[PDB]
């Protein structure tokens, strides 16, 4: 009964600050504490610190003192800052929080943000070109066919990809980015639906690149043979 | 610091039967308070880790009780007493006592289901694509098992290379199969000088590979 809301996935240049913000609600009879974590794409899990109910702060030596976490005007509102940022920093960030009942007793890492992406790079950001994949008889399987469609040349990750505004989720599979010789990123998410509601259905992609506030809706229609 | 091994790094396990996933400490766990600060986590694609055990072998809240944790020391291991097909994911431990909090490396979870020969489709470039100068050909391998698949295109019978990119999604919670996705790409020019496109897929469920294809301009 806890939320932890972070800021959204970004790009940070080279030597520069990356600065996150995270919110957490649902405490009310205890203290709380808020401790920080980080996954590079594809590993595993670093501790970056914490922020102790009174304000006080324990860091990752690792961090090398480049790690500041702080709390902000807003109620429940707290920011980390790493300055002089490398490639090293490229990760997902997460903020965990757990009920601080005093000194001697406190628990950790009980409820988790969503994660937020930071893509430590010198390059400009680039919204997805949407393309469809069409269904035909190509794509029908007995009954069933498959739609979806290519978000492609954009840049940093991620992307997120719904259908029908959220309303369709069933038979959905929205694959890994691929990274092009080019430097951006190509994903496709594919959705398998009766073939008898093509003529009746509207099939539509919601891409949203929060990077470079890029949304696009892609309907998808159907070909001929 | 801390250095937390996790045993094994990989978890294939077939559906009912038991897991078990150990952890190692460099430094006794044990604190001053005669508590023991060892965590485990699990953590699904592209999502964040979710809390399962706090001091050693509590449960949280909504986690069944065929997961259970024990240990003492340095010596840690989760069990899952009968694996469902929604225990896939990467189990990782931690510990708080000691500064810093260390992790250990991830154990990724897999189901051994039976052979499910995967449902191939293909997809045409869009006119969108095309007014821009490129082509890309979608090749898709829907709710196969096991992982291992492969994936060939053929322009008019000819074998491409270097010109394709595929990615596979983690296994499936609830059928425990993998989707694999691939693209082909090519300019408008060479797109537009080839007429049969395919994409020929090879893996255990299919007693011979199996070959998708268009030519375009059909329809």
């Known amino acids: 009964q806890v939320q932890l809301q972070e800021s959204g996935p970004g790009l940070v240049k080279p030597s520069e600050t990356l600065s996150l913000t995270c919110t957490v609600s649902?405490?009310?009879?205890?203290?709380?504490?808020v401790d920080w974590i980080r996954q590079p794409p594809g590993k595993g899990l670093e501790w970056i610190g914490v922020?102790?109910?009174?304000?006080?702060?324990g860091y990752n030596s690792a961090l090398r003192s480049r790690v500041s976490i702080t709390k902000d005007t807003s109620k429940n509102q707290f920011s980390l800052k790493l300055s002089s940022v490398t490639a090293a920093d490229t990760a997902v960030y997460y903020c965990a929080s757990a009920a601080y009942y005093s000194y001697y007793n406190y628990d950790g890492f009980a409820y988790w943000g969503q994660g937020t992406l930071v893509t430590v790079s010198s390059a400009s950001t680039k919204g997805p070109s949407v393309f469809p994949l069409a269904p035909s008889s190509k794509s029908t399987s007995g009954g069933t066919a498959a739609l979806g469609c290519l978000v492609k040349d954009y840049f940093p990750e991620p992307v997120t990809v719904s259908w029908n505004s959220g309303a369709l989720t069933s038979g959905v599979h929205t694959f890994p980015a691929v990274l092009q010789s080019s430097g951006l990123y190509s994903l496709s998410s594919v959705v398998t639906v009766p073939s008898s509601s093509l003529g009746t259905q509207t099939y539509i992609c919601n891409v949203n690149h929060k990077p470079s506030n890029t949304k696009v809706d892609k309907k998808v229609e159907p070909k001929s043979c | 610091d801390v250095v937390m091994t996790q045993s094994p790094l990989s978890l294939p396990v077939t559906l009912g039967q038991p897991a078990s996933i150990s952890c190692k400490s460099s430094?006794?766990?044990?604190?001053?308070?005669?508590?023991?600060?060892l965590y485990w986590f699990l953590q699904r694609p592209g999502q964040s880790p979710r809390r399962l055990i706090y001091?050693?072998?509590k449960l949280d809240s909504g986690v069944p009780d065929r997961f259970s944790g024990s240990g003492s020391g340095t010596d840690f291991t989760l069990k899952i007493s009968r694996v469902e097909a929604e225990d896939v994911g990467v189990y990782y431990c931690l510990q708080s006592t000691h500064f810093p909090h260390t992790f250990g490396g991830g154990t990724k979870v897999e189901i051994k289901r039976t052979v499910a020969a995967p449902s191939v489709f293909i997809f045409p470039p869009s006119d969108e694509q095309l007014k821009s100068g490129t082509a890309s050909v979608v090749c898709l391998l829907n709710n196969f098992y096991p992982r291992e698949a492969k994936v060939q295109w053929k322009v008019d019978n000819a074998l491409q290379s270097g010109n394709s990119q595929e990615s596979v999604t983690e296994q499936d919670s609830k059928d425990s199969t993998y989707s694999l996705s691939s693209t082909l790409t090519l300019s408008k020019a060479d797109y537009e000088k080839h007429k049969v496109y395919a994409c020929e897929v090879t893996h255990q469920g299919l007693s011979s590979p199996v070959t998708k294809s268009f030519n375009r301009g059909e329809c």
């Open positions: 001091l050693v072998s």
């Open positions: 649902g405490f009310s009879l205890t203290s709380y504490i």
């Open positions: 922020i102790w109910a009174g304000g006080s702060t």
């Open positions: 430094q006794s766990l044990l604190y001053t308070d005669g508590k023991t600060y």
